[PDB]
Amino acid sequence: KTVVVTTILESPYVMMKKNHEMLEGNERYEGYCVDLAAEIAKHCGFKYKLTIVGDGKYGARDADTKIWNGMVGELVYGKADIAIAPLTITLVREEVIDFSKPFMSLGISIMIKKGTPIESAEDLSKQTEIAYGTLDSGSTKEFFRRSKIAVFDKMWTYMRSAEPSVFVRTTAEGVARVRKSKGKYAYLLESTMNEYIEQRKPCDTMKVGGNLDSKGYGIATPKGSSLGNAVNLAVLKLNEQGLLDKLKNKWWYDKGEC
Amino acid sequence: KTVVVTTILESPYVMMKKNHEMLEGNERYEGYCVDLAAEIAKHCGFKYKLTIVGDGKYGARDADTKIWNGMVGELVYGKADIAIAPLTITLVREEVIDFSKPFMSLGISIMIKKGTPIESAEDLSKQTEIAYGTLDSGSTKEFFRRSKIAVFDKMWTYMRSAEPSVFVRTTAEGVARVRKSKGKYAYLLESTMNEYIEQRKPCDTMKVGGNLDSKGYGIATPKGSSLGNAVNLAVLKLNEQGLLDKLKNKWWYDKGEC
Ligand SMILES: N[C@@H](Cc1onc(O)c1Br)C(=O)O
Ligand SMILES: N[C@@H](Cc1onc(O)c1Br)C(=O)O
User: Residue positions of the PTM Phosphoserine (chains A, B)?
Assistant: First the structure.
């Protein structure tokens, strides 16, 4: 039957076409993951319906209720058959859902307003003039919360108690904050999103320093789903064919505005 | 039996004494509402236990689940017997819980960093250079969300879509934001909290313009609770005895630091 795909509005993975109100179904969206879903579906031989995750979250488990939210939750509770989005492969998630090998590699990075005197995470941790934060949910926030590494521990300690809050609801908000804070706010996010934004007008942001870690995004399916095998092979095939690199260039650099 | 009082950490209504770790029970807290609870209990002849609302919220109903959160929720679901805090009497709340006549009068107001060229709500609505917001929950946010008054409608329209978010988690955060934004952020909050903060170091904030509305805080009890009658009479008695005004002066001006 028609496969239900859960995904999330995150540029340039999935975005509403400017003229979406005049369109219907899958045609309403565009982006790297929209193109990827089409390729995966073709190689696995299934028809699908793109749906945007109800709560706009990636996926975490509430420590008290033990309930999973976000795209991970939609898979865990059977609300969706597959997640095709910039969903980071992590230990906690790997335990409850299946993941294809990575379709994109990335790492946590620093985004600054051009001119900000910051070149690394160490730089940020050793000062207070420039505030810094992460998304209010997801693997980056979790990276800092769980890190036992001195420098990252120091940063988390500062972030968790910083006032006003240094956390944002969406990537768009973090970017807006960096752009409007006159260099007094730096944003910690995944290298992939950082690199995309660096090529977007008004071209006033920059990725600085090396990535804090090395990981990847994977296509997710409910644990034990018979669709997992084919999907994983499709990702490997698409990568080996150079299609994934082609898609990355298409949505990141081919039409960079900077 | 011992009455369970739900309240909230909001200065100067209820605050943790500096040395709370060395104290136990009700002795751990201090403030206007702590003193008020003692007076109400004495006049109604009951023993009580102060408890801080689990979710740190005042009280709203989720439009989807219809579940009440905050102090209102604790009363509605029988987790607490009475709420003694700066809980605003509103139509939606009055329908599900009982309220004593007001023990304090107030209205929505504007807090600015001294020197900010803003004298009214109209001023704020007609410009964009200075951002402004409210608590991310409670009667003030709701006032703007539901207002059909042109000026407030205009302000809500701007606030709801402003990026980054102009909403804060606690009063303390809104104050910190006003103080650290060099006049580029104004905070909308209740006159009572505004007046208290204006007398606190570093004495860099000011209440401007007249209040946007006129309302009051009431002591709340589960609907139909036999404790409601006595509590209401106690509030009226304490007010007529001048005790409420005495308490206001004690926690607002007697030890003002400005
Ligand atoms: N890919 C992450 C989400 C995320 O993590 N950090 C960010 O800035 C974003 Br967007 C995840 O799967 O949680
Ligand atoms: N008293 C209000 C809470 C509140 O509403 N606006 C604020 O700034 C605060 Br604190 C309520 O009962 O919701």
Answer: 147, 181
Q: Which domains, from first to last, does chain B contain?
A: 1-106+216-255 (3.40.190.10), 107-215 (3.40.190.10)
B176 touches chain A (CB under 8 A): yes
A24 annotated as a binding-site residue? no
Residues with CB under 6 A from ligand 2: B 10, 58, 86-88, 135, 138-140, 171, 189-190, 193
Tokens describing residue B177: 């934001």
Inter-residue contact A193 to A58 (CB < 8 Å): no
Quick one: which H or E segment has residue A115?
none
Report how far residue B191's alpha carbon sits from residue B107's, in angstroms, rounded to the nearest whole number: 5
Q: Which residue has the tokens 């979790």?
A: A142
A125 is in an annotated binding site: no
Q: Which of B190, B193, B205 to mutate to test the pocket of ligand 2 (most atoms within 8 A of CB)?
A: B190
φ and ψ of A203, to 5 deg: 50, 45
With 0-12 / 13-18 / 19 or more C-beta atoms within 10 angstroms meaning exposed / middle / buried, residue A65 is exposed
Q: Do B172 and A163 touch (CB under 8 A)?
A: yes
Please state, as a whole number, how many other Cβ atoms lie within 10 Å of the Cβ of residue B24. 8
Resolution (A): 1.6
Q: Is the CB of A33 under 6 A from ligand 1?
A: no
Joined tokens for residue A136: 């209010």
* CA A36 vs CA A181, A218, A237: distances in Å: 35, 12, 12
Looking at CA atoms only, how far is residue A168 from chain B in angstroms? 8
Q: Are B60 and B39 in contact (CB under 8 A)?
A: no
CB A86 near ligand 1, within 6 Å: yes
Chain B hits for A128, CB-CB cut-off 8 Å, are none
The experimental method behind these coordinates is X-ray
Q: How far apart are CA A242 and CA A237, in angstroms?
A: 9
Contact A257, A200 (CB under 8 A): yes
* Interface contact B173-A180, CB threshold 8 A: no
